[PDB]
Enzyme design. Sequence first.
Site, short mmCIF file in Angstrom:
data_model
loop_
_atom_site.label_atom_id
_atom_site.label_comp_id
_atom_site.label_asym_id
_atom_site.label_seq_id
_atom_site.Cartn_x
_atom_site.Cartn_y
_atom_site.Cartn_z
N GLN A 251 0.77 -1.22 0.13
CA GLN A 251 -0.09 0.01 0.12
C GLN A 251 0.78 1.20 -0.16
O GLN A 251 0.72 2.07 -0.74
CB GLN A 251 -1.12 -0.10 1.31
N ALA A 252 1.83 1.54 0.95
CA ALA A 252 2.60 2.59 1.16
C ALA A 252 3.34 2.86 -0.20
O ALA A 252 3.46 3.90 -0.71
CB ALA A 252 3.59 2.47 2.33
N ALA B 124 -0.97 -9.66 2.98
CA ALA B 124 -0.20 -10.63 4.03
C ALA B 124 -0.58 -10.18 5.61
O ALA B 124 -0.12 -10.58 6.62
CB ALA B 124 1.18 -9.97 3.90
N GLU C 217 26.67 6.35 -8.49
CA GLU C 217 27.19 7.41 -7.79
C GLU C 217 26.50 7.83 -6.46
O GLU C 217 27.30 8.24 -5.57
CB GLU C 217 27.07 8.94 -8.67
N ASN D 202 7.17 8.29 9.17
CA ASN D 202 5.99 8.77 9.11
C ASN D 202 5.55 9.95 10.14
O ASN D 202 4.75 10.87 10.12
CB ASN D 202 4.61 7.79 9.07
N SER E 277 6.87 0.01 2.51
CA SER E 277 6.83 0.27 3.98
C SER E 277 7.62 -0.79 4.77
O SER E 277 7.60 -1.93 4.36
CB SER E 277 5.42 0.27 4.65
N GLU F 105 -3.10 -7.85 -2.96
CA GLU F 105 -4.12 -7.14 -2.66
C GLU F 105 -4.96 -6.17 -3.59
O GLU F 105 -4.17 -5.14 -3.76
CB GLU F 105 -4.55 -6.84 -1.18
N1 LIG Z 1 3.59 7.59 4.03
C1 LIG Z 1 2.44 6.64 3.92
N2 LIG Z 1 2.49 5.56 4.58
C2 LIG Z 1 1.54 4.58 4.23
C3 LIG Z 1 0.73 4.67 3.40
N3 LIG Z 1 -0.19 3.57 3.43
C4 LIG Z 1 0.43 2.86 4.15
N4 LIG Z 1 1.45 3.32 5.19
C5 LIG Z 1 2.37 2.82 6.18
O1 LIG Z 1 2.37 1.43 6.07
C6 LIG Z 1 2.23 0.85 7.43
C7 LIG Z 1 1.59 -0.48 7.19
O2 LIG Z 1 2.01 -1.39 6.30
P1 LIG Z 1 1.16 -1.09 4.85
O3 LIG Z 1 1.87 -0.45 3.54
O4 LIG Z 1 -0.23 -0.41 4.76
O5 LIG Z 1 0.81 -2.76 4.37
P2 LIG Z 1 1.18 -3.50 2.95
O6 LIG Z 1 2.32 -2.86 2.43
O7 LIG Z 1 0.07 -3.31 1.82
O8 LIG Z 1 1.29 -4.81 3.31
P3 LIG Z 1 0.14 -5.77 3.75
O9 LIG Z 1 0.07 -5.80 5.22
O10 LIG Z 1 -0.16 -7.19 3.16
O11 LIG Z 1 -1.27 -5.06 3.58
C8 LIG Z 1 1.67 1.76 8.48
O12 LIG Z 1 2.62 1.91 9.30
C9 LIG Z 1 1.37 3.12 7.55
O13 LIG Z 1 1.88 4.13 8.15
C10 LIG Z 1 0.75 5.66 2.68
O14 LIG Z 1 -0.07 6.00 1.64
N5 LIG Z 1 1.73 6.87 2.96
MG LIG Z 2 -2.12 -3.74 1.96
#
Ligand SMILES: Nc1nc2c(ncn2[C@@H]2O[C@H](COP(=O)(O)OP(=O)(O)OP(=O)(O)O)[C@@H](O)[C@H]2O)c(=O)[nH]1
Ligand SMILES: [Mg+2]
EC number: 3.6.5.-
Lengths: 437, 427, 62, 338
Positions: free
Chosen positions: A11-12, A99, A254, A206, A140, A71
């Site tokens: 997601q992130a 996950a 670099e 964050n 993330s 997902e």
């Molecule tokens: N800066 C920022 N952080 C995010 C964002 N979306 C999720 N996060 C961070 O990601 C962390 C949770 O992991 P996720 O990236 O949401 O989960 P994932 O990478 O999709 O992996 P899964 O658990 O399988 O869903 C949290 O601590 C959030 O702060 C975003 O759009 N921007």
């Molecule tokens: Mg996710």
Amino acid sequence: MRECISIHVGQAGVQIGNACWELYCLEHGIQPDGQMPSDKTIGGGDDSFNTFFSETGAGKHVPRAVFVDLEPTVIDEVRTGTYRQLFHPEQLITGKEDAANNYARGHYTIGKEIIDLVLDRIRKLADQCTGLQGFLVFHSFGGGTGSGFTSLLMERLSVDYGKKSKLEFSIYPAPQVSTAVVEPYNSILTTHTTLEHSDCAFMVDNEAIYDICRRNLDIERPTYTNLNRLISQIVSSITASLRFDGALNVDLTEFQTNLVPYPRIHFPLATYAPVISAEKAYHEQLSVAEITNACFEPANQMVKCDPRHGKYMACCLLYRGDVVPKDVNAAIATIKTKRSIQFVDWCPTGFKVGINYQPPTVVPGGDLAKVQRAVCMLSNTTAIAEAWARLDHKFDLMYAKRAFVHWYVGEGMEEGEFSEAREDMAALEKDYEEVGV
Amino acid sequence: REIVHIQAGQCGNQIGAKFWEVISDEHGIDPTGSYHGDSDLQLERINVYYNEAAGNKYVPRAILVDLEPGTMDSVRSGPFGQIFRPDNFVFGQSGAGNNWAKGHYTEGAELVDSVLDVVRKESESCDCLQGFQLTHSLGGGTGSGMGTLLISKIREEYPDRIMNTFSVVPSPKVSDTVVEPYNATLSVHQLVENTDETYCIDNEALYDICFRTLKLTTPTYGDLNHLVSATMSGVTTCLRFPGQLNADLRKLAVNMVPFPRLHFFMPGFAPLTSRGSQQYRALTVPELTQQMFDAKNMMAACDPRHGRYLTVAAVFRGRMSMKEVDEQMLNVQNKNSSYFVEWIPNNVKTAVCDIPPRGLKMSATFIGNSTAIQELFKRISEQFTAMFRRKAFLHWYTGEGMDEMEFTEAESNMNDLVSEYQQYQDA
Amino acid sequence: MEVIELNKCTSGQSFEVILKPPSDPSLEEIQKKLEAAEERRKYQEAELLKHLAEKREHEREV
Amino acid sequence: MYTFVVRDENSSVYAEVSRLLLATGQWKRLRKDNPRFNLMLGERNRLPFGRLGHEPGLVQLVNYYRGADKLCRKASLVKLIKTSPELSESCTWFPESYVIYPTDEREVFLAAYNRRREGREGNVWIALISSEASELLDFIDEQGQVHVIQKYLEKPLLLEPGHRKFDIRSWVLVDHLYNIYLYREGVLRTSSEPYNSANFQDKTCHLTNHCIQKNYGRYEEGNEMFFEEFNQYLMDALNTTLENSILLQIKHIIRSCLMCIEPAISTKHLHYQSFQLFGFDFMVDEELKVWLIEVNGAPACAQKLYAELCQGIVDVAISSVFPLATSIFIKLHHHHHH
Ligand SMILES: Nc1nc2c(ncn2[C@@H]2O[C@H](COP(=O)(O)OP(=O)(O)OP(=O)(O)O)[C@@H](O)[C@H]2O)c(=O)[nH]1
Ligand SMILES: [Mg+2]
Ligand SMILES: Nc1ncnc2c1ncn2[C@@H]1O[C@H](COP(=O)(O)OP(=O)(O)CP(=O)(O)O)[C@@H](O)[C@H]1O
Ligand SMILES: c1cc(CNc2cc3c(cn2)[nH]c2ccccc23)cc(Oc2ccc3c(c2)OCO3)c1
Ligand SMILES: Nc1nc2c(ncn2[C@@H]2O[C@H](COP(=O)(O)OP(=O)(O)O)[C@@H](O)[C@H]2O)c(=O)[nH]1
Ligand SMILES: [Ca+2]
Ligand SMILES: [Mg+2]
């Protein structure tokens, strides 16, 4: 000209990638339909912007990007968003069920079923590359996909692409915008498994982005959208040298030469200024001296820490807008007198400076005011290890009780990986302190 | 991400019907299964709980189970009876006689395979099933004995799917028969193994709440079930409405359950309201936060101050300042941090949904994973032992094929569970 | 003080300023780690399905 | 209701501050590892500064300044003076000192000493107090780690009756705004045996430590003379006052030291905040010149004053940040225009 492939995991990573590729299009004048009028190299070229975009015979400029989530729902928003025409379906890879914030689930259980397909769609882009430098990997620490699958992808890329450089942009977990509690586990597991496959990693806490948005953008309770637009500005500052004419940080190699003398200690600290609310009525524009000096205020850092209580091994200043070398060096000399800036004894005390005259581009309708000049400082300081200390202490508190461990063991992971990764972090924490005191 | 819902027995079907009645209204579905709402927000996740049929009609993904037909006949002639898929009414005739053995081993065994056929039929029509939920009591025979048999057999056929329950724990204050401690103890063992989240509704807390706070001198089961369905709607809000972040049942369970056997939660709701009695004054964020953390608003008759919180989830509904929520939530923890385990950092999490429930501009739902829940299991064990040391009323069970050993076993496992909670209360 | 490697183009310029001088595992091992964890999973799933099978026997016996 | 934790049990001063805080009814103590504290009373070793200021919704304050050890360690203090221009190898109030490592500036100390022996000038040094360079260079290698060599003040002001020696201890509170507060009450940790200018090996009249003096108690109660008397003795014997002859220099030295390291340790814009209590140790020669000996970063107070100082810390260092529902400090500030 050498191409760069961007990998956005979870997601992130996906939502940050959208923020970045949207900003890239505005900076290069690429429209949402992929047309770039100013490019007269129709259907091809080896301009600097071609590092990040490929071209079609119909003049479409397409990111060298693969989005991967376990997902569909986040990447579906890509397939229907303003830049839907930019990417083509082969770049957007989704699973069925995620996950669940479980590193073991993203790495072992679910990762095994999708790794081969992803490497194939990556190898479809690397085939279009006359010469590939490597990869920029966005993810993330906290998520199960971002931690678990990312580290599996990175292990394999070092196999399939042994010569080829790998850089990460990593979101360090903060309680204020996370509804998860096991993020310290995932962070340490992914760092231990990714560390010796990553040449350079830019961490973004964050917590720091969140407070920057509150303090300087006057946003009561930031959303991911507020955070991601700010992050993309910083990511763009870091990658601009790869996309525009210049002589500093022109290839991924670099980046480690200039920023990473020690391979293990490859976590540069980014500091960015100025961040100004677009809704701020009257703003006195800030000088080269003021923005440069703001690079040494902890409140402007991507990770809250105190560089005064560590040692620098390298430092780059990246300027966008109306800046000339004379003013940069005058500002540095003033800052040297006033501030504690102490290098390791085997590194020169100095700054690598890159200036791009185009002032930073801002998303229309965003929270950032246009500014006459901005700077991003990339400093490799041992003070960033404070972030490892915070994360490791949280890990120790839960693991002493084996809280939540049963979730990871139940996906096929052994309790011993927990202790292996933790001691690797303990070694890393001492590497930082050997160098820094 | 679909959920399959199952309700078993007298208590299970009465609270279960209220759940579908309450959320069907929240999603603008009328007793005919026809949508007549205003927003699109109330149809975006509607697939979670409803199947879409011919005529743009929405049918709950619900299976209704009993060993006697009385309560299910009353469901179909009930306020929202027509909406349920008639093939999903699965019922015998002999009853379970408030007997766990009958529901688990003899009468329920005869019927269970028929129920699982419907479960399978509803599952195979799910693009990505994310788990099951059950409503039932632990004091009777069908919901307690057959409900836990279903759960065992569901885990056999779907071993990787999340299973959550609302389980009404018996209490002598609101009680049908004397063998309820027996049926509850036998059921709890099964729940400890085969559920990911069990929301423990203690029927005397609902009673004390209805009497001491809603000023109802003789509360009925109907008054008790209004409180339960308020909580059921509250805890499922963030799956049924687009919001801050969406987690599937697995991710939600991962971050709430640090130890597999300690998954018995303390639910609560604020403001506490009675049927009909109209509330006119909306609560302030500080008022919601104090009340949802107050022992009086808990529905498991356990003092949270006698234990420590392992994890907490809070779901606020309505228009309110998420900043004010953050500050008020952070104020409760920082003011009583000795009731939170210091070795699970940041173990209190929050979500907000703009859609308020029917009749309230603003509400909050509390989900507490506290070690204080051991007091509930200590109560059942005392009542269990008081009869079992004299082998009282066991003939009802030995006549269905059970041995004393299975009771000794059930007693020992629950005493283990109590001692497991005590380990983490002192850590 | 000392400004070096200055380099200029139409887009911008870059240079360096010194204030002072100084004083992988194989696809084999990967496949095995993953499959040694997938077997760890089916051992655990089998023990559950076995434990459920002993229960079923007890139900027949009652 | 503010909250705090305690992580140094040997601390006499903050043991009393803990008592004051609890007895207000608006502060509550948590346990050592409870990270939800407003205030931390930290350990002296390896205090985890990197973990402060990351608790959402908690203003966090610690009773130590990260980086202040460069002032409170003899090896580092010597370094800081001859390396910071604002103190400058020519500093007038710090004794001539060198850093010597056991087998560095030992060569530099050979030369600066040779025209102090072969220059016909007074000559004694301290780490052991001797007058021959080899008596000392053999002792530092024999004991272990790095020691500081320092010129020894052969002409200390002597307190009559007794022809004795003394050192002055002043307690200084730096709050989160970096206000420098001098506690008005200092103490003289005096010797009771007359100073023996010839035999330095007997170190009971040369070393004024309150413990190493335990003629104890003859002249004053505890080998501790307070400021009201020392002022009176100065008036009667030398016609001057404490303020004019000594204290002005003390305030000058305190301010110069703390302003030197302010950029390195200040928490103005930081995500957490620091105050700290220091004990400065001075040493007056016969010509009424004040010398800085050492800066103690974890000082213990004197028995009559614990009540007053520990209250003062609570009033200006803690309650300034965590307000609750004439002054005993002198504020050290000075902006001369030039
Ligand atoms: N800066 C920022 N952080 C995010 C964002 N979306 C999720 N996060 C961070 O990601 C962390 C949770 O992991 P996720 O990236 O949401 O989960 P994932 O990478 O999709 O992996 P899964 O658990 O399988 O869903 C949290 O601590 C959030 O702060 C975003 O759009 N921007
Ligand atoms: Mg996710
Ligand atoms: N250059 C010098 N000339 C004369 N005397 C000196 C001196 N340096 C130190 N001393 C004497 O040595 C004594 C103790 O020295 P020092 O202050 O290093 O011990 P210490 O660190 O144990 C004091 P505290 O207990 O407050 O920490 C003082 O009484 C002082 O008079
Ligand atoms: C589905 C979801 C849930 C909610 N589970 C949950 C939520 C959160 C969490 C961990 N778990 N952590 C959080 C942080 C912030 C916000 C929310 C959560 C409970 C449930 O149980 C039943 C069982 C029978 C029923 C029923 C519901 O309705 C009718 O019958 C079913
Ligand atoms: N809250 C509530 N509890 C009930 C209701 N009916 C029965 N119970 C409880 O459940 C127990 C009896 O179980 P029962 O519902 O008969 O189980 P069944 O045989 O599966 O129908 C008693 O301890 C009651 O307290 C009801 O309508 N509401
Ligand atoms: Ca081109
Ligand atoms: Mg009944």
